[PDB]
């Protein structure tokens, strides 16, 4: 370490776009139209996503059915794993049941009853699992307070036999315009997490959160991603359709010496 | 700390452009034409530089006279301090003698006879001083080996009564295409330096080195600057004419919480 990364694993890009918070996805789900879902699956895959996040959004429909449908629909057209994005454990498990390959669970909080439910499920289905550094008492402001919750996630994951390489800790980034002070604490938390065990737990962020409902988001997203990667970030749920963002990531990845430099590294990175 | 900065000092931009390695500067110096020097002084000032680097470049002329002339010529049209960029101590001192305000000396190596000459000169003229993490044995590859030389710089500066706030340690960045492995070690060195004393020594880089004689430099420069700033960088000799670079810096500066967020932060940053 500290800033010299222990490993050289490719940065993991999790395409954010198949998420019922978006109208087109919400309506495709309403009309059970698989076309918009498959279009976004293909697009994200073509941009180099390693996982596709899958989030039902708000719905009065049975989320179990919706999640199932999304997963099957996506995996019908691309050979990519899903990052199953829900607080509903039955929605998650339904997705895991029809999922081809190793999925990612998104996510468990540091709440004990959440951990007790989600960890055995990741173990059972051999899925990676995201653990958010938060509980019912809320999201901690301080890096140190986030880190405690991180420690608690590590302990529980390990207690379920889940390897650290399968555990992705999310310190929860918040919009810089209304929660500016969090952004730097998150960086420091990422650094701390990378110290917690050997091998270390991985780290992940909902990157776009940092600019949500801010003006001129693309600059802010790509700046923060570079900062986070520097701090040790292993993965991000992010807009893989943003070419400038992915260029930024590929450049940081080279500058961290995790992939051998060549003149065509911007392309190389997207294939990896 | 660690990544949460102790302070909130504005990032220090040192305009790189008045440097005899550039033909127009070299020729302005040859013809003793003050116009190109003053033009670049004004331009850089308008882009928000806090210092202007001043480097004679290669010349068969008396560097003492050249440096004097450059400093007077620059300060004739802008109210900015100079970052006097030479290995010739008499060139440096000549510049310090005619310099208006507090200059920066660029630089001393960790060579003992260099330190013994340059440190008393900074003290005497009340100039900030850059110390490069290198000596006659060469530039160390490892962060740890760079850090030792950093430690030696701190010790000597302190032994001359120079405050840490006046000492800028340069771990020497090298082009990523031929010395890729250095870039991450430099980051780790910056982090380490920020730990060496209280208050900590400052840090600085010749940023453009990272892409020198590489294709598509602007992306690489701005990515690395963001990484370096994240690691703790306080200043950089850089191309302040590169708007994308300065946007990148301003965004990182906000994300580090060193300046209160507002929607117009890209402008705000350039005035500060
Ligand atoms: N583990 C984890 N999972 C997450 C998040 C996280 O943090 N951590 N955060 C979220 C990450 N995904 C997104 C997806 C889109 C946006 C986004 O920004 N949406 C547009 C929608 C615009 C439109 O509707 O057209 C907006 O402006 O609000 C933000 C985060 C959801 N999942
Ligand atoms: N303390 C310190 N001082 C420094 C450096 C450093 O590290 N540390 N490194 C240098 C930083 N300044 C520059 C200025 C320009 C360029 C640059 O890249 N020049 C163009 C010139 C093109 C042209 O001639 O038109 C090029 O392509 O080579 C690189 C570093 C000099 N001073």
From TrEMBL, chains A, B:
One of its GO terms (cellular component) is cytosol. GO terms for biological process: homocysteine metabolic process; methylation; tetrahydrofolate metabolic process. This is 5-methyltetrahydrofolate corrinoid/iron sulfur protein methyltransferase. GO terms for molecular function: cobalamin binding; metal ion binding; methionine synthase activity. It comes from Carboxydothermus hydrogenoformans (strain ATCC BAA-161 / DSM 6008 / Z-2901). It comes from the Bacteria. Keywords: Cobalamin, Cobalt, Metal-binding, Methyltransferase, Transferase. Residues 11-256 form the Pterin-binding domain. (6S)-5-methyl-5,6,7,8-tetrahydrofolate binds at residues 21, 85, 106, 170, 209, 212, 217. (6S)-5,6,7,8-tetrahydrofolate binds at residues 21, 85, 106, 209, 212-213, 217. The gene is acsE. Belongs to the vitamin-B12 dependent methionine synthase family. InterPro entries: Dihydropteroate_synth-like_sf, Met_Synthase/Corrinoid, Pterin-binding_dom.
